Amino acid sequence: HENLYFQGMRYLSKDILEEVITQRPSDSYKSNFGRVVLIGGNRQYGGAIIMSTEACINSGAGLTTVITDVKNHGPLHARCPEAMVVGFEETVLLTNVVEQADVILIGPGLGLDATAQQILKMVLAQHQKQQWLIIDGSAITLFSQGNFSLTYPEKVVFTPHQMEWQRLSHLPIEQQTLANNQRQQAKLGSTIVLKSHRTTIFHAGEPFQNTGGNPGMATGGTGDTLAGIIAGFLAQFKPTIETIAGAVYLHSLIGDDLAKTDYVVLPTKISQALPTYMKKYAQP
Amino acid sequence: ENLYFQGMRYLSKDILEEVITQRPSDSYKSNFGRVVLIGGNRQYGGAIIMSTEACINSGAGLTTVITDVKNHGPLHARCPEAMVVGFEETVLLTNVVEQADVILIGPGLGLDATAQQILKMVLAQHQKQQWLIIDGSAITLFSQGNFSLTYPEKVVFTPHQMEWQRLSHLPIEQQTLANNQRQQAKLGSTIVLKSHRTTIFHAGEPFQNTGGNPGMATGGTGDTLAGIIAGFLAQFKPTIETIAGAVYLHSLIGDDLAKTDYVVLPTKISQALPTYMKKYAQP
Amino acid sequence: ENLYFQGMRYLSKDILEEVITQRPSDSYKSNFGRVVLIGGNRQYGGAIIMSTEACINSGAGLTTVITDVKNHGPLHARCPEAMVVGFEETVLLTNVVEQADVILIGPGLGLDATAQQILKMVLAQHQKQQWLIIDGSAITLFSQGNFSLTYPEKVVFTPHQMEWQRLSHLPIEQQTLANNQRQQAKLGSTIVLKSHRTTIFHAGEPFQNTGGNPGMATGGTGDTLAGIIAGFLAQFKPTIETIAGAVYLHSLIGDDLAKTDYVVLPTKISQALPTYMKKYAQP
């Protein structure tokens, strides 16, 4: 059989990487490549945020700050000394770093407890119109349970797996059709990166359909890694949803390549491959 | 010359082709199992760190480590994929054990009262669908306490010879094929009896591993094996062939590394799992 | 087209052949200098960790890091060669500074009272034979306080443009070759004025670096440079050519890595130092 494609949907290929990944201007400094703040990693799940951090740094973000439990700062710096670190208890400093951010990612390893809830509320309250805000993992669950309302939804990006999306959209998985998914995207006014074997991105335009991904990537940290890549991309590249699609595509391209040799693809190997892959596509 | 026993089954690469399946296209991480690894007191925390690296690299979908909070930092520096729970975190520890598909207890665990209490809790809650691997000092604790098995057929012990002597009451001299088999039967569990040619006793005919080398005779080799067994049970068919494939792969990689390496660092075996498993994955 | 200034000297590989000497057969580690690196508060500890890796890989004989005790663990995980002293350890800190051949203060240092007190102590004790490199926030602190230089000719400042504006009082618009040179003269120190083409102002004719690329425009690149400068001054002739060679090598490695790497991790530059330096070592 030949493939079947849905009309009104953009199927992703290397084309998206050529479009999104631009050659850096010779007059650039690190501030031109964005300030990212990554928020997550409670005391049980600190490795999640460490994996997002490695992805963000390796994707080319200019400056990366991590708000995470102080417990996690040691191993984070052992792996990623490029990252700056702020503890959850550091109320004023964490507010300062969020205020300065170009991109905020909240959710990897964040958990569901009262501290997690408080930090999410502070971030949602503090969010500025021009800042990208990526809500991932347990932050989606808390968002849906806290009956919040988004002030500036147009630069919010949710990255749910199917059960997180059920919770956010109230669409049972059986009802998560292209039409229904799009309608529920429209109701939020935000971008939905609906993760699956073939991730789909819903937004104000024609949806993007990812064409990669493999079950060798079905391991803890793959999603944390993707979230970090998305954040690093939004930090550096044009503020359009194509940039998010480029991140999603590159994540699965690298993972698909690694799976050719690796039965399970360690998520940190995708991050470590970013600089060489991005160089190959950088639009000259 | 070799002495062969007619009832004995000799492992080869065939076991890997049988056990290691191609993953289905529609799989998600929960399909490849939730593993809980329990061990690593304040002296021996490296042991659980080595088991964890083996488990993650073997392809387990999710890995949580219950170990002294002292060890959480170095563990995450090496293995950020792992989730971590301290020995003091009683409610959380209980929850993660309850949710696990495979529980490994023992690497670096030591012999203290906290170790006995967690073993007690794990054994009390053991569910029929869960695999429980009891390794190292946890075997000593099990044998010395009045601990019993509700579902022995889902329990795997991984003793060295002195641990088997404690568990089976067979002195090393008396550890013959027939006597070993008889004491397995009495337990109703799988016994991975570690030696130069590790032998696996179970309800069927015993398996003997044909590999292994003294370049692997270094601290951590057994902790590594235990993590591979855990990861294999998390992903593959619930049969003793799955356990045999873990044992065989561990020594295959070790034997290959020993061709170039005088001593084989146990973490190198773990690091080679993804490439070896791809090679043998039943296509 | 390029604009050339007749008084300006353009760096090339010749500077490396001049600076990087073959080590004498009878050398010991103290011959390659004692470096003290001072920085890394609780938010920015990675910065001092990156300077330390650069310093060690550059060939400094002994490296001690004065940084918050929070940072000592990850630093040793990455750089076990480094010795570590906390900010609170006042007698020991004073001793290591006294014994140093080269002192670098600033990477990740922040602006708090402890940072001001240590800067004060370093400046007060500065010995004529010691090199002192003042980097990052330490430049801000120096300029805002009533700090002065007893031996300015052994002091190197490494400002970005806004730090130079604070130190020299020249707004960016006014930062011309002539004005920059005049404010160097007023200080009597070496100014490594970081930009796309870093320019070094000193008592002689200025040097301009000819390399550098936006793949290096990431957090840590400057912390790395500062460690290379420190290591070079610890080992090589006490002249401004030594500083120029550090600047040039840093960007040579970065420019080479950028051929394959979209962003150049600063730690990769550090890791490449031993192989690059061997290649250029004046035979």
Add this chain to the structure above:
Amino acid sequence: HENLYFQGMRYLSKDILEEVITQRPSDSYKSNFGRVVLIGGNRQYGGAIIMSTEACINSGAGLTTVITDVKNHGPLHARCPEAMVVGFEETVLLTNVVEQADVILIGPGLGLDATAQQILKMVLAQHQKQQWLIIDGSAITLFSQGNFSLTYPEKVVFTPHQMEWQRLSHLPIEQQTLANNQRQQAKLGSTIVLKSHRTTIFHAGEPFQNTGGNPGMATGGTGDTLAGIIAGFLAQFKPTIETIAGAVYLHSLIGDDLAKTDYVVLPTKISQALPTYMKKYAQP
């Protein structure tokens, strides 16, 4: 010019590696490869003991335990999870591990303070005739200042650089002649590994003269690394001074090889090369 050699002195070559590094018997277990205890690393100098630990593990020691400040246990396990760890405060446990050891190394990063002094005295008091005891670095200085006397000197190995040897032997560097060095070795009844550009080993037999070493190795940690190799060798191989000479030779062979490509030879690179080098010489 052709070389000049001293009569009554064995000049080392790969021959020593073939002699010392034996093929392991197929019936071996980890206990056959010795229990080593490494003691050092105060709060300032913890990296020293971490470097000795990596050398010891990579050299093939069966089991390695480190008695070091608890501060150091995290980074030690991040690099060397094979090692077991005991804090200086753990009086009973540290005594237990020393009692069981086949080889004790004391001194890398140990420092000179009261805790260092106490631990050295405990170890010297506890030493058993059959145990190898390597006294390195600041432990040599403390040994010389504490006017100690060795109970079983024949299995003590001192590893001084020239100024440490001046302190131990009272020979000014000018007076450190072959004859004088040997006489002062004889007075102690111990092995002296007198480290230099061309390390010399004095003992009850003809001295060994190392023929390698280079100034690319003149960096902090080189000596800590050597001490760990010596300890791992004594753990596994025949209890003769040739074993110590083999360790010293291999350390400089690897360092000399690495210096061909590396301006400075990171000491941890020597350790990481041990398994491949030892395989090449293992006497079949």
